Amino acid sequence: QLKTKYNDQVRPALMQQFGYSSVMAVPRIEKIVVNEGLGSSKEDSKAIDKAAKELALITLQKPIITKAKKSISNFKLRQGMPVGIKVTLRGERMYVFLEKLINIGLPRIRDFRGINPNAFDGRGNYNLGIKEQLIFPEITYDMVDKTRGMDITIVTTAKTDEEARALLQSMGLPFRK
Amino acid sequence: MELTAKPRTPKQKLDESMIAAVAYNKENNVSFALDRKAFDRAFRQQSTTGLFDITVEGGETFPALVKAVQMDKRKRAPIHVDFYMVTYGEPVEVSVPVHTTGRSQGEVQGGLVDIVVHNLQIVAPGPRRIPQELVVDVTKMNIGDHITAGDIKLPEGCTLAADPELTVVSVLPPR
Amino acid sequence: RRKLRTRRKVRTTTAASGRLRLSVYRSSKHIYAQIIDDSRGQTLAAASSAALKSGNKTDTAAAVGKALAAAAAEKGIKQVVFDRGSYKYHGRVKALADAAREGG
Amino acid sequence: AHKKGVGSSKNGRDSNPKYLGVKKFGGEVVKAGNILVRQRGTKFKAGQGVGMGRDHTLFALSDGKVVFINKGKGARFISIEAAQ
């Protein structure tokens, strides 16, 4: 259930593609997240639950309610009030859910075709903006509430985006060429 | 320029037409007090890209460049000066004037060419051969033609201290 | 981060205290259970675990605490004070403590 | 009643009695209890031997001589290099 081809396919192939002075200095993956900035447009003391309950069975992790920065701008805004939802993943659970996506997640996506190329976190870090939650190996509409979405963050030691992509792809990732 | 005295007391001159400067480098920072008029007729030309003979009373010719002059308000009259003894292979950096030449294709056109930056300071000049001016094109310039430092030809060696893309001049429109 | 060490350290009064402080660098397995005298940038004792260890390091725990408590003896110190670091007074460090906090 | 503004805005009547400053200066044989500085925030920070009241006031716990120390501004201290 992963990590060998992680190094192997990635790591080695990396020196066998690049030239790293170590295995330490090779782009890896720090953490995968699931931001759930729902509500606001939907102040459902009830809807908030859909997410967590959900996120947790598809990310196997109780998330936190990233309450409003207390920001109270012109439109609907106020103090520190439940707005979004954060769920960070690293190492295990990361790879454990991660794999789902590389395996089932995206592959099992209606209208799916691949994912955008163009550099993101010039930090050598990549970004993923998922939408409809209806494409999850867990997501059950015949057992949920309504239907929503979500955003995922790729945190990678990658110093450069060049080094990023590869890692990202070899490790499992589709590109719409 | 035959400056002679150099005491801390300028009485013996403040009345008597005589300016009061100081010059140095890092070595000697000798006290100074030259003639008003002389310097007055002097600095004019050479400005700050002009070195002249400094034979302080006693016969000890010296080489220096005009550093910073601080003249009187209420009276365009000048009062204090700074000379930076010329070096040999490097003085520091200097301040060089931007100059236009040849009628511009903007003047006649319908507008007037404006020199955004009058004098311009460039990194390293090279003592012994330091540009006491800097002619510049303008003709090509038309309806809003900006010319930056990274344009003006350079006097073999000198490097531009001023940001290149910086508008040294630009043809201004009518009204 | 650092904050933690400077808060802990700062909270520990210097010469208003009169007492002495014992440190510790146990984020490594190279603790240093150092003892310093307020004013003078002097160190009175110390009882690391640098002189070998036998194999233990997170285990040499109370060892170094013991190696220090009795250590001051050859100086003769009665009142001292714990200026731990980030090290949130757990077991590893509590070691040195209790160890010394009784061996003294 | 009527239909305007209770009181006329933009005034300028009254202010406050006010005090503060430095009660004891550099080299004054303070005493147990003497107050040495009325400040507001922590202009002068409690040095060595100088107890600091609740209003950032600054007093002397023991006796001795008053000492002033100011490192690059920001942080200043009043100490008590006692005589004896």
């Binding site: - | 600095f43 400005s47 002059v69 308000k73 209420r74 301040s95 930056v117 004098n119 311009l120 201004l172 | - | -």
Partner: protein, 136 residues
């Protein structure tokens, strides 16, 4: 002319120029030789005058904006507090200062662009040219 927003009132005192360079933005320039209070409306009085003499090029610099509110007698009384936030706005010029400095027009088409512009100022001014090389 007038400032865009602010506090409201002020005071009054004097000492000679402090930040009125010389050459900058132009080849010719006008300098005030007496401590005064330039009324914004006495600036317009210049600008406009100066304009007329010129047709285009607009190489006229007014480096003396009015940062200063003055006041007035509401009619007479005295029993009340400070007054007339809006009498007008003033810009304190001091000796040596530079209110004006055209550039581009003939030496002469410059010595008239001021002459007139000088006939409507509460003080005495003289024109100037170059050798002005302090900071740049």
């Amino acid at each position: 002319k007038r400032t865009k927003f602010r506090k409201q009132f002020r005071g009054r005192m004097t000492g000679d120029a402090k930040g009125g360079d010389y050459v900058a933005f132009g080849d010719y320039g006008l300098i005030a030789m007496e401590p005064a209070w330039i009324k914004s409306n006495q600036i317009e009085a210049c600008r406009i005058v100066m304009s007329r003499h010129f047709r285009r090029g607009g190489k006229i610099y007014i480096r003396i904006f009015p940062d200063k509110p003055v006041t007035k007698k509401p009619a007479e009384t005295r029993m009340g507090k400070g007054k007339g936030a809006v009498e007008y706005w003033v810009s304190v010029v001091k000796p040596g200062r530079v209110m004006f400095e055209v550039a581009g027009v003939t030496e002469e088409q410059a010595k008239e662009a001021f002459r007139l512009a000088g006939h409507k100022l509460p003080i005495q001014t003289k024109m100037v040219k170059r050798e002005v090389y302090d900071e740049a």
